[PDB]
Amino acid sequence: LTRKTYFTEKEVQQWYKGFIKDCPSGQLDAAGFQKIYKQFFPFGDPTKFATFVFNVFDENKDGRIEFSEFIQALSVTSRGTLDEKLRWAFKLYDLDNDGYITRNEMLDIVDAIYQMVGNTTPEKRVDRIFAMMDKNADGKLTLQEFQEGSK
């Protein structure tokens, strides 16, 4: 009985039917996630990125994606406003969950993105956007620095 999500509730209904359709156990864990990413990027190694994305999906950090976490992710990512979408992206970068994005963290992401695709540089690229987004130049990005930098 969500409705705390951009879905109608003859929409939660399909998404659940689809959920137990894909994953009948009702719990897809890191391993399953990791392999479908292997299918999603068969010209690279999605392992690093697959993990960062899985970590944002699994909000209570138990190592499983329940429906609540799956259906909220979809809502935000597919239908939420730009801020809400950027807030979700922010969590992905913020690996240690301390509320900032640092240079090596963002480098890690760019490195993950670079690794997942890479046969068909991260360093110079991150310096570019961080210098761009980091207005006060403290070496950290706040959500606000990130949201505005992106827009």
Binding positions for Ca(2+) are 58, 60, 62, 64, 66, 69, 94, 96, 98, 100, 105, 134, 136, 138, 140, 145
Distance CA 134, CA 129 (A): 8
Distance CA 69, CA 128 (A): 33
Q: How many residues bind Ca ion (CB under 5 A)?
A: 13
C-beta of 42: minimal distance to Ca ion in Å? 28
Indicate whether 148 belongs to the interface with Ca ion (CB under 5 A): no
Distance CA 137, CA 145 (A): 10
Is residue 37 within 8 Å of residue 115, measured between CB atoms? no
Given the rule CB under 5 A, which of 29-37, 73-81, 111-119, 126-134 is the region that contacts Ca ion? 126-134
Is residue 79 within 8 Å of residue 15, measured between CB atoms? no
Q: Which is nearer to Ca ion, 44 or 48 (CB)?
A: 48
Distance CA 116, CA 112 (A): 6
Choosing from 54, 57, 94, 147, the residue that interacts with Ca ion (CB under 5 A) is 94
Residues 39-68 that bind Ca ion (CB under 5 A): 58, 60, 62, 64
Closest CA to 109 of 85, 125, 86, 132: 125
Given the rule CB under 5 A, which of 8-16, 17-25, 80-88, 131-139 is the region that contacts Ca ion? 131-139
C-beta of 30: minimal distance to Ca ion in Å? 11
Half-sphere exposure of 62 (CA within 13 A, CB side): 8
- The residues binding Ca ion (CB under 5 A) are 58, 60, 62, 64, 94, 96, 98, 100, 134, 136, 138, 140, 145
